[PDB]
């Protein structure tokens, strides 16, 4: 068991999209009659005129290899660029924003570390739209620090440090490579402010328990070992 996000919200959205595609197929929508391996949930634009970010069930065969980028979701409900792009003329998808949004809300309650939630809230309050990671900055692929990252600048396929549900080291999808592209500048380093936000969270365990983090809330709280 790795100290890493299980990406449980994304898994649930993909499974719900597979069911929705199957239902549309039964309604006669031929292009939705596919195996489950062809269907994922992505938060993205759609065809021409569908210019807002919405949750949609996409046939992966209709997605472009690169980008109109598509976004996946972390277990605190934040959308982050994932591999691929929308073909604005040829996309094969079903927009299902309400049900998929509701599933994200339900998932956040289950899976989002209160420590990470606090760090994310600090970042969004100070720099709207940003989320917290301890990851790379611009043109340096070694150094990590707690920063408020513009979500568009993160890579879902790259895991980066985040806060567990015990306020301990954890890794989450949505990270930086430390490259030197323009996107690599889109962050605000906030070591003191993020650390304070994390330290302000009340423990799920008593002062007489050891917190062992888990990929779902709550963590394990074990009775501290006695002076045996
Ligand atoms: C704002 C400024 O110039 N501050 C001076 C200090 O510089 C900042 O130091 C921090 C170290 O914590 C960062 O290296 C700085 O760079 C970034 C960052 O926060 O990582 C780089 C980002 O690309 C940039 N984000 C953008 C352009 O979108 C981000 C923001 O500009 C700032 O965070 C906004 O506050 O900065 C760097 O700006 C300097 O260390 C100090 C003494 O030398 O004096 C500060 O005034
Ligand atoms: Cl996560």
From Swiss-Prot:
Gene Ontology MF terms: carbohydrate binding; host cell surface binding; sialic acid binding; Toll-like receptor 2 binding; Toll-like receptor 4 binding
Region Interaction with host sialylated oligosaccharide chains, residue ranges: 93-95, 185-189
Compartmental location: Cytoplasmic vesicle, Secretory vesicle, Microneme; Host early endosome
Disulphide bridges: 17-57, 25-33, 72-82, 76-112, 123-148, 162-172, 166-211, 205-221
Phenotypic effect of disruption: Significantly reduced invasion efficiency. Reduced production of IL12 in host cells during infection. Slightly reduced virulence of parasites in mice. No significant effects on parasite gliding motility. No significant effects on parasite attachment to the host cell prior invasion.
Domain observations: The galectin-like domain has been demonstrated not to bind lactose, glucose, maltose, mannose, heparin, fucose, L-arabinose, N-acetyl-D-galactosamine, or N-acetyl-D-glucosamine. It interacts directly with the second and the third EGF-like domain of MIC6, and with part of the acidic domain.
Keywords linked to the UniProt accession: Cell adhesion, Cytoplasmic vesicle, Disulfide bond, Host endosome, Immunity, Lectin, Signal, Virulence
Control of this protein's activity: Sialyllactose inhibits binding to fetuin, a host glycoprotein. Lactose and D-galactose (beta-galactosides), but not glucose, mannose, fucose, melibiose or heparin, inhibit hemagglutination induced by MIC1.
Motif (CXXCG): 72-76, 162-166
Result when mutating residue 189 to A: Abolishes binding to host cell surface. Reduces binding to fetuin, a host glycoprotein, ability to activate host bone marrow-derived macrophages and dendritic cells and virulence in mice
Membrane-spanning segments: none
Chain residue ranges for the region called MAR domain: 1-228
Name the UniProt record assigns to this protein: Micronemal protein 1
Region: Beta-finger region that is required for the interaction with and correct trafficking of MIC4, residue numbers: 206-225
Known role: Soluble adhesin with carbohydrate-binding activity. Binds to sialic acid-terminating oligosaccharides. Required for attachment of the parasite to the host cell and subsequent invasion. Ensures correct folding of MIC6 and transport of the MIC6-MIC1-MIC4 complex into the micronemes. Facilitates the correct targeting of MIC4 to the micronemes. Triggers the activation of murine bone marrow-derived dendritic cells and macrophages and production of pro-inflammatory cytokines, such as IL12 (IL12B/IL12A), in host TLR2/TLR4-dependent manner.
Gene of this entry: MIC1
Subunit organization: Monomer. May form homotrimers. Part of the MIC6-MIC1-MIC4 complex. Interacts (via the beta-finger region) directly with MIC4 (via the second apple domain). Interacts directly with MIC6. Interacts with murine TLR2; the interaction promotes activation of bone marrow-derived dendritic cells and macrophages in the host. Interacts with murine TLR4, the interaction promotes activation of bone marrow-derived dendritic cells and macrophages in the host.
Protein species of origin: Toxoplasma gondii
Cellular component terms per the entry's GO annotation: cytoplasmic vesicle; host cell endosome; microneme
Portion of the parent chain present: 29 to 259 of 456
GO BP, one annotated term: effector-mediated perturbation of host innate immune response by symbiont
